[model samples]
Target: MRMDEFYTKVYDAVCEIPYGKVSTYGEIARYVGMPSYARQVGQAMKHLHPETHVPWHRVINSRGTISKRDISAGEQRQKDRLEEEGVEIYQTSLGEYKLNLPEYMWKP
Candidate 1:
């Protein structure tokens, strides 16, 4: 419906992800009753207020990797944040790391 409404639902879903747990963009979308809005969920996180309680970093891609954003340093920052929460990350053969979704993925 409205943008704010969408954002509120998305943020609410994001907040549901407990500490040390993670979810995919699609997962958040589905949880918020908008299963087709995975990309929109990402957009909401992109514009999320830094001061808000939303754990934006907890949302990843369904491919089990953090979706790269405009900021070159964001990837590492997200990784560090996840690591600090005790979520395990593994490096791929190409040197890029991906989250073990099956292990850390939150089930609601």
Candidate 2:
């Protein structure tokens, strides 16, 4: 049931994340049948171009937090994009914002 590679499967799963919804890297990894490759899923998102329609901003860490790929500015942009799609983001004690996964995590 595996595709030729993880890149295509990862991108396909990311595309399935509906607007206003979010998913964890682990969730996408599992959805693509590579349940232990959550970090790889994050890596795939990290390589996404700004022009892609894969909804890269809809992915988060298992703690419902965004993983800072490089800088806080990039994280802020991801949060802004998700907010524009109507997903509610809340601040954690660490001063980073997280999406309320219980309320907004996609089931599909």
Candidate 3:
């Protein structure tokens, strides 16, 4: 599929994540009918336009970690964004943190 088509689907899917909830790249891909295109979903987000309403920050890794590569402050923006929405994120073990999947996974 074209990049624009992929981006559009992923964009719409991510936007569906309600406030106080979060989703993963894999989740978004699966929800958007491209279960094996997990990395493609992330790429779409990375290429997403800031002016558009896509909530790119709302998607996290399956490991429950945000991308350290972007968001210069070590994903503080992503973490803070979720926290502001009242999602519980906790450090489980060394270098391991998780978002409360049960409480926040978008049930659409």
Candidate 4:
């Protein structure tokens, strides 16, 4: 019910993503009670604070893919952060990768 402000909801939703686990934008939208607001979730990610300490990279596409836009803008930083936490990353194609849930999925 706290979906009034866009950024607040997005921050809450992203923070809710437990460590080692990843989620799709749609999944985050759905969980935050905004099923079609996945795009909004993506927008919110862009506003994350560099020192916030939240693992923003953990959220991926519903297809289990990382955000391509970030990659082009330099996402290796995030990737490295995830790797330190033990998340196994696999490149499906040159521009796509998947996080091994078995090794990274976080349980609530």
- Which of the two candidates, 2 or 3, achieves a greater lDDT against the reference? 2
What does candidate 1 score on TM? 0.90
Window of ten residues with lowest summed lDDT in model 3 = 65-74
User: How many Å off is the CA of 9 in candidate 2?
Assistant: 0.5
Q: Across residues 1-108, which tens digit of lDDT does each residue of candidate 3 receive?
A: 776787788888888888777889999888878889999987887775657677777888886666666445546666777778777778767555576665666767
C-alpha TM-score for every candidate: 0.90, 0.88, 0.82, 0.79
TM-score of 3: 0.82
Best by lDDT: 1
- lDDT assessment of candidate 4: 0.71
Could you tell which candidate, 2 or 3, scores higher by TM-score? 2
The clash numbers for all candidates, in the given order, read: 0, 0, 0, 0
RMSD of 3: 2.2
RMSD (CA, Å), each prediction: 1.4, 2.1, 2.2, 2.8
- After superposing candidate 3, which stretches have Cα over 4 Å from the reference? 50-52, 70-74
Cα-based RMSD of candidate 4: 2.8
Q: Which candidate would rank higher by TM-score, 1 or 3?
A: 1
Candidate 1 lDDT: 0.84
- lDDT per residue for candidate 2 within 21-64, as digits (tens), equals 88898998899889988888878887878787778988898888
Pairs clashing within candidate 2: none
